[PDB]
Amino acid sequence: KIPGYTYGETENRAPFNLEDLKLLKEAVMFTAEDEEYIQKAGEVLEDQVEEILDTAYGFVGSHPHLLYYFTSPDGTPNEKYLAAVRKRFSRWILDTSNRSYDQAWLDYQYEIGLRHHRTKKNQTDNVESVPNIGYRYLVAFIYPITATMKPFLARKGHTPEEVEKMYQAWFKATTLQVALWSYPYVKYGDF
Amino acid sequence: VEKIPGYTYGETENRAPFNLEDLKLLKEAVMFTAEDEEYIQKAGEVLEDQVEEILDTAYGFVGSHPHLLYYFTSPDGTPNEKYLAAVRKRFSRWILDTSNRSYDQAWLDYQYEIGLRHHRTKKNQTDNVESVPNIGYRYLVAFIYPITATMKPFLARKGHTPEEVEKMYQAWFKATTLQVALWSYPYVKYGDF
Ligand code: HEM
Ligand code: HEM
Ligand SMILES: [C-]#N
Ligand SMILES: [C-]#N
């Protein structure tokens, strides 16, 4: 088990429902085919997670304004914070690949959005850090997250066609999630 | 040189609430560099001659989903074909702007405007139409995927190498993400952007 990780155990229901999710899946072109391919993506990625994490956090670490969101008040990275989040992000890779996108999934989507947002940021790990991750960067990061996965999706010898299907599934699923995470950021009634 | 109705790039009457430094830092967040400047322009060269088919594909997708076509509907629930047609011209222009404009303060000011036009702040004013008041933000983010995906097959059709196609597509992905991120502004609780 993973400190702070509360998938299936959250103490509120998402403000969006499974019909919302159906309609949003449609908007991101995500079908049963992507369910199959995202699970394949997971089989490919799961034993490469350490390099994936180094690559993702390598990017974050290289830009002071991104590393910012993990910083203590003194502007230095909070290493406790980075380490705890890293474990939860590792598990997110698997959840994205392996979970049914069902109500528990939706409820945790709400929770992850809340944790990036000022509502709950810094509470899971009991750290003193910056209060809010600007929404602009959540959207932005759809790109790096997907770009990070791409080279790894090839490393088990899958063909460019099969890799493209996995990569596209990942792209759709990452976009889907960030769309959901906007909820706590967006003015009531505008979501 | 005919005006595209409603298109007001470079003549908006608000300054964007985000500046050149905000943009630099956002470009950094989507991994956008001088290399993507090269390849986004190349992308424009390939797409510009295929826009009718690109638009038919994009709006085919929108039209195939009642909850998406919804945002172009008259209050009676029926699609407003004048609204669709006018927006289509401005979207066509946006393909060129994404490829061809320098992303400077003028570009930024139009980004803010485009976000306002999706948002209840300005939606339906540009074309003087009556329609649904707001496009739910969830769908703007969602549309990063179909907009990006729509371009991919077209990027191959001037016979660039698969590497160059992939780089054009990646530039397009970055630039689309970048813009949708900026368009969040009017939707986002003040101070949380
Ligand atoms: C595609 C966009 C993003 C994805 C997929 C993503 C993924 C994740 C995941 C899976 C977690 C842990 C969730 C949990 O608690 O179980 C997390 C937390 C966190 N992420 Fe992100 N993230 C994204 C955007 C960002 C950005 C732009 C930043 C800025 C550096 C960032 C920094 C953080 C921080 C500081 C936490 C801890 C929040 C807290 O205090 O609970 N994330 N992210
Ligand atoms: C990647 C996301 C999106 C992109 C790149 C995009 C692109 C554009 C562009 C370029 C325009 C015209 C801008 C101008 O006035 O010069 C526009 C307007 C419009 N778009 Fe989008 N769009 C996106 C998301 C959406 C979604 C999800 C919908 C829902 C159907 C939508 C529906 C509309 C509508 C109804 C207008 C007219 C708004 C008004 O009344 O002014 N767009 N869009
Ligand atoms: C976010 N890591
Ligand atoms: C959107 N058009």
Numbering used by the authors:
A (entry chain A): 5 to 195
B (entry chain B): 3 to 195
Reported in the publication:
Protoglobin (Pgb) is a recently discovered haem-protein with distinct structural and functional features that make it unique within the globin superfamily. The MaPgb* structure can be considered as an expanded version of the 3/3 helical sandwich typical of “classical” globins (i.e. Mb), with an additional N-terminal extension, built by a 20-residue loop, followed by the Z-helix, which precedes the globin-fold conserved A-helix. Residues belonging to the Z-helix contribute to formation of the Pgb homodimer, which is centered on the intermolecular four-helix bundle built by the G- and H-helices of the two subunits. Thus, in Pgb the access of diatomic ligands, such as O2, CO, and NO, to the haem is granted by two orthogonal apolar tunnels that reach the haem distal region from entry sites at the B/G and B/E helix interfaces.
In the Trp(60)B9Ala mutant one cyanide stabilizing H-bond is absent, while the H-bond to Tyr(61)B10 OH group is maintained (2.82 Å for chain A, and 2.87 Å for chain B). As a result, the cyanide ligand is slightly tilted toward the entrance of tunnel 2, where Tyr(61)B10 is located, with a haem-Fe(III) coordination bond of 2.25 Å and a Fe-C-N angle of 151° for chain A, and 2.27 Å and 122° for chain B. The Trp(60)B9Ala mutation sets tunnel 1 in a constantly open state. Only a minor rearrangement of the Ile(149)G11 side chain occurs within tunnel 1, which is however not sufficient to fill the empty volume left by the Trp→Ala mutation. Interestingly, the location of the Phe(93)E11 side chain in the Trp(60)B9Ala mutant is superimposable to that of the Phe(93)E11 in the MaPgb*(III)-cyanide complex, thus indicating that the presence of the haem-Fe(III)-bound cyanide is enough to induce the Phe(93)E11 side chain rotation; it also suggests that the insertion of Trp(60)B9 side chain into the haem distal site is only a consequence of the cyanide binding to MaPgb*(III) and of the ligand-linked conformational change of Phe(93)E11 side chain. Therefore, ligand binding to the ferric form brings about a ligand-linked conformational change which leads first to a rotation of the Phe(93)E11 side chain; this movement, which is observed for cyanide, azide and imidazole binding (but it is somehow impaired in the case of nicotinamide) creates then the space for a consequent “induced-fit” structural change of Trp(60)B9, which brings the Trp(60)B9 Nε2 atom at H-bonding distance from the haem Fe(III)-bound ligand. Such a sequential mechanism is confirmed by the structure of the ferric cyanide-bound Trp(60)B9Ala mutant, where the ligand is coordinated to the haem-Fe(III) atom and stabilized only by the Tyr(61)B10 OH group, the Phe(93)E11 residue being rotated by about 120° relative to ligand-free MaPgb*(III), even in the absence of Trp(60)B9.
